[PDB]
Amino acid sequence: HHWGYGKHNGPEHWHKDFPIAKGERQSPVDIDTHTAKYDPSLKPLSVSYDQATSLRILNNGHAFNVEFDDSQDKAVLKGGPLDGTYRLIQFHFHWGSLDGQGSEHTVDKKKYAAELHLVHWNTKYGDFGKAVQQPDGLAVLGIFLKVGSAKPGLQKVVDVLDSIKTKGKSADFTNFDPRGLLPESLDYWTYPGSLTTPPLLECVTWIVLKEPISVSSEQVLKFRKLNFNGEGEPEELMVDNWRPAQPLKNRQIKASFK
């Protein structure tokens, strides 16, 4: 598989290796705020990140992943639309070449500069590989980034990026507190969807926060200095690593708020 984000290998081509690309519950989607319905029975959302153990940061040629120790219930998501306990495994971002694009989800067709995905898996399936084969296997917490004031809790990430410029490079990344990347409010929209990259598996409960975080232009500029290529290959800047909105089909987006 040689998928990516270019004219020759980007989202319009994915379907040929991964036919689920045209399936019934693909992500991302546009969130139409006037059509999403408040659902009073959503239970409160529980983000329990106090014992998180970050380990490593990896440029995988598509994004950079901050990986966690998920061998125990250290950092978990519960409540909201979720049944049971979902364990944090990694977070990453999608971003643009310019501040007017980058996010995968859209809000009333608005694109944000970037979007953070905190990926968790349902502990009742035992491991991540099993969980992605189930319709309720994953819960992805999505957080929009807008350009404004700097996010202090992001800066440790931004400063390590020079050490993982190219595909396949990793760095030790211990003691990073993902609580520093959250907005104040946990108001969200939720809907059933998919992974936004190959293999495009229809295994995700999406939880998208309404309130964006603000990052500085300098912060996002540093994201854009990464490379999709490996070391010693032609430089291709890691920008516009986002999949556009997919058809909603037979789905309803629920709001946790009035």
- Binding stretches for ligand 7Q1 (CB under 6 A): 92, 117, 119, 140, 195-197
Whether 62 is a known active-site residue: answer: yes
Nearer to ligand 7Q1, 123 or 216 (CB): 123
Cα(19)–Cα(256) distance, rounded to whole angstroms? Answer: 33
Min dist. Cβ of residue 120 to Zn ion (A): 13
Nearer to Zn ion, 94 or 210 (CB): 94
Q: Is 243 in the site for Zn ion (CB under 5 A)?
A: no
**Position of minimal CB gap to Zn ion:** 117
94 in a labelled binding site: yes
Count, residues near Zn ion per rule CB under 5 A: 1
Among ligand 7Q1, Zn ion, none, what does residue 119 contact (CB within 5–8 Å per kind)?
ligand 7Q1
Min dist. Cβ of residue 34 to Zn ion (A): 26
Min dist. Cβ of residue 52 to ligand 7Q1 (A): 17
Tell me which of 1, 2, 15, 62 is the catalytic residue: 62
92 in a labelled binding site: yes
Among Zn ion, ligand 7Q1, none, what does residue 140 contact (CB within 5–8 Å per kind)?
ligand 7Q1
Nearer to ligand 7Q1, 88 or 140 (CB): 140
Q: Which residues contact 189 (CB under 8 A, 6 or more apart)?
A: 31, 36, 206, 207, 208, 210, 253, 254, 255, 256
Nearer to ligand 7Q1, 190 or 197 (CB): 197
How do 188-193 and 76-79 pair as beta strands?
unpaired
Cα(109)–Cα(75) distance, rounded to whole angstroms? Answer: 32
Residues within window 95-124 making contact with Zn ion, judged by CB under 5 A: 117
C-beta separation of 66 from 93 below 8 A: no
1 in a labelled binding site: no
Q: Which residues contact 41 (CB under 8 A, 6 or more apart)?
A: none
Torsion, CA 68, CA 117, CA 94, CA 146, rounded to 10: -120
Nearer to ligand 7Q1, 104 or 212 (CB): 104
Lookup: tokens for 45: 């959302």
15 in a labelled binding site: no
Among Zn ion, ligand 7Q1, none, what does residue 229 contact (CB within 5–8 Å per kind)?
none
Location of structure tokens 């977070």: 91
Catalytic residues: 62
Positions at the binding site for substrate:
196-197
Residues forming the site for Zn ion (CB under 5 A):
117
